[model samples]
Target: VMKALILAGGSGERFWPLSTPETPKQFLKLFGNKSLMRWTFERVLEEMDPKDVIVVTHKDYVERTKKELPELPDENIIAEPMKKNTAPACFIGTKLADDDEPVLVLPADHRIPDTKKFWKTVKKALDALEKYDGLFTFGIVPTRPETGYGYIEIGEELEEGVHKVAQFREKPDLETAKKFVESGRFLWNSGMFLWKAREFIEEVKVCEPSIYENLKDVDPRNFEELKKAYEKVPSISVDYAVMEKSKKVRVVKADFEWSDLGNWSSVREIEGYTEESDEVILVDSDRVFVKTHNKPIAVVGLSDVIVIDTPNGILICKEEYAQKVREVVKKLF
Candidate 1:
């Protein structure tokens, strides 16, 4: 049977202090009381069975993952020793499954508010993947030419809501992004895909032979032998590795609300910041979007900010400029 493969691996450096190396953003209760991973699992489970939903996380986070979703079978949770990015993660997932099934790969770290819409779109994409042999991805209908996000230029119309991809703009400059937004056929890259289990393997074999060779041992359950294959793979993203260069690449325009949750400024909006609070505790006074203890964080005249506190660190920053939080974490460790 076809399955859902959620990429559960992330460092959560942008949300440091509150989000540590051990308990990253996906594992923390940044949104309400439940962890983000919990939300994702439950949300997807609405359309997919728990047994058919597999989570692919960094090897280090494997233990806590068990605690997060205990209902899943042990084999459903696959772990990777290192971060080779999405290409390696997706390929490894392809290795774990039967050759003919469909696979829906997605990020485990995003903040998707509309679960109903997400489920509908997911079902649609899976339907398309089932009916066609082409590779499929989700594209957010463009809201603005926000420079922070990558843009998808819609090419020839394929179906009712699907389209051929003209090009993918890699976080263009402000002016270019604005123009694309105004041009009428651009969308946000959602980084979600639907493909045959063997399709990704085939792409790897044809486009990325070196990485494919190492991942080959995975399909037949040769775990020991697969380690050697991983050593040969280059850490590349699926965008650069596959979608950008594939003739079979197709995009399904998504109607659901979406966010990568990349910037702390954006995260603050999601954290009930608009509601006034008198006191708040931030792990790092300098960092942004943190109400560590959920106290009344006071903002007298503060216009823009982010306050975050994790197990090992804390961060606070201007709300508009919270995306830079990662740079601080990167410079440190």
Candidate 2:
């Protein structure tokens, strides 16, 4: 049986007015009634038992995560004393699992509408693990020249749907991203991964010895000990600390409609809501999204812009600058 680990500790500064550090994007019910975290939890529950599932989140969100996912056992909801990035989070999850079973790591906030396709690809990766002892990452087939995501260059096919990772490319400039898409050899790094807990720990030991040394013996279930270990562990992503440097890494091509819900632009892309509420009126405004709280609003002569109105504040910005919302959020604090 495969265990699932959901990473749900992001600050989500890109979605400022709606998502704050205390209540991040994963907890927001942006799409419908269910929060993104709930959506992810339910998606995994479709394939695995609740006991086999784990959620590693910030200490602050442990109560909230418990409130949202009552079906999950209390112990299964692990909390990080501090945000040490995915490397430490992965380490904690794998270490706490305490078995040789394969762990499927997932981000809490990604939008994967096709559950059937997702599970099919996940099954393929898990089956491949039986033959290969490599870390498997799901690579979404690129639809466009997206600069927001990292790219995985495909190498020779190891099997039907799996390929050796040729190289991992960081977020590129627009022209570089366009070239990557045109080359037809790159896939978007979806940030979801599958690997044996023991195998992942071994790779971490080899690539990031400091993380291994600090956390190798600490019990993640023990918050006090884990806190001390986290103090010495380096703050880095698993991609940078392990996958990028590991000799055994594979990419599983997944052709499913997906979105990280990275910014407000994604909200516009997914919902196609020029106006979220009936109170919003558009006057010659093309590609504008107006979401307000029962307030009659009008937009005039605006293109590719987003307007979010809440009691906290109102946010108005061009869609292209969606990623920069994080920078704006930083200045406020």
Candidate 3:
């Protein structure tokens, strides 16, 4: 049987005021009336059984996760005591499935508009995992030279929809990003992946021996003992610990509309910069985005800036430096 794991333990630091520790961005109703996690779960349900889908989140959010996704059984919502990053969550979630069953790992907060296409592509990846002996990830066809997203360079075509991964590049500078897009062999790293439970565990044992050693004995069913074990694990993303090092890795080219929504800047892309139900008012400004409280906000003589208002504080930041919002968060805290 195929199983799905939703990684939902992000700190939500990029978009301040709107996203915070108590209420992470994933819990916010960023799209329509449903929270990001709710949207993710609903999408997954279209492709898998409710019992087979597991949500791995922080210990503090178990109740809220349950509240948002009541259809999920209480056992399906696994919580980590401390934040140790994606490597731990992937391992923990992988353990939920049998060694031979294929498992899918999905980010809790991405926006993929073409749900049918996504399901088809994931089905292709799961098929590839069954036929090929390697790890697989979805790679989006790049529409622009986006500096915000990671890139996956494709090598030889291994099958109809699968290709050997040449390399995974970090978010590049403007010039490098332009070159990558022009090369025509690059795809935006979507971070969605598929693999057999034991296949991934074996790769982790080889590439990230230390992490495998620490987590090899963890029982995903025991919340109390799992929390104690998690408190001692090191912080590391699954990309660094496995994907970047594994010799047996492949990527499936995904043709669909997608966005990570890393910051407030991305929200502008979907909803656009206009005054509407968000209680925003703008004059003498172009390309300025705002998310505010009950008070009406009006801007003049400003362009390419973002305005965010919350009880914690108000932010007026230039669009290009939106990723740096977390740096300011450090000082405020």
Candidate 4:
């Protein structure tokens, strides 16, 4: 049986007004009633036992994570003393699991609508681990020229659905992103990974020795020791510390419809709703989204705009500047 680790410590600055430090994006109930963290837990529960799954979040969110995910055992929720990025989170998860079984690492806030297709690709990646000793990452088939995501260039085919990773490219400019899409050889790095615990630990030991040295003996079950280890470990992402540098890396092509739900515009794109409530009146407006808390606001002659009204703060920005929400958040405090 495989274990899963859901990384849920993001601050979610991109989703301001609604996503504060106390309640980040993963806890937001944007889709219907269930939070994103709950959705992620349910998807993993379909295959593994509740004890086999682990959720790593900031210490501040441990109580909230438990409140949202009652099915998960209290011991399965690992709280980090501080935010040390994905490298430490992945290292701790791999250390906590049994050495032989494969561990699946994923984010808590992504929206994957097709569960069947996702499992199909996941099964394929797991099966490949039997024949190959490599760290596997899912690569979503690019649907458009998206500059917000990193790209993975595919190399020689290792199997039907798996391929050797030629190179990992960072988020590109719009012109470069357009070329990548036109080339038809790149896939969006999904930020999901699969690997045997021993293999991942071995790679980390070689590629990122500092992480191995600091965290190798620190048990996840021991909170005090874990905190001490985290203080010594450097802050970095697994992609930069291991996957990009390690030679044994593979890419699994995933055809499932996926979105990180990065910002407000992405939410509008997925929900396809102009207004959160029918009470909102739009007169001569086109491509505008209004989300208010029963304010009964009206938009007249506005185009390509997003209006988010909440008790904490209100945001009104052009649709094209949706990614700049983080810029506004930085200046607020």
Top candidate on lDDT is 2
Candidate 4 lDDT over 1-333, as tens digits, reads 789999997788888889887778999888868999998998888877998999888889999988999988999999888887888899888887888989999898889988888888889998998889699999999898876788899989988879999998886787989988898889999999999999999999999988999988888878788888888898898999998999989999999899877788888878665853466788888888878786777888888888889986999888767788898778984
lDDT string for model 3 (1-333, tens) is: 889999998788887888888888999989989999999999999867789999888889998998999989999998888888888889989988999998999998899878999999988887888788699989999888877778889988988868989998876887999999999899998888898999999999999877787779988778788877777777888887888889988999899999887888889888888663446766678888887788988888889889988997899998878888898777776
| TM-score against truth, every candidate | 0.87, 0.94, 0.94, 0.92
Output the better candidate (2/4) by TM-score. 2
* Candidate 2: tens digits of C-alpha lDDT, residues 169-250: 8878889999899988899999999999999999999999999999989988898998888889999998999989998889
Of 1 and 2, which scores higher on TM-score? Answer: 2
Candidate 1: list runs displaced more than 4 Å.
219-224, 271-277, 280-303, 309-311, 318-321
Evaluated at residue 330, the lDDT of candidate 2 is 91
**Model 3: residues >4 Å from true position, as ranges?**
275-284
Give the Cα error of residue 149 in candidate 1, in Å.
Answer: 1.9
Ranked candidates, highest TM-score first: 2, 3, 4, 1
Ranking under lDDT, best-scoring first? 2, 4, 3, 1
User: Candidate 4: misplaced stretches above 4 Å?
Assistant: 273-285, 296-303
Error of 4 at 269 (Å): 1.5
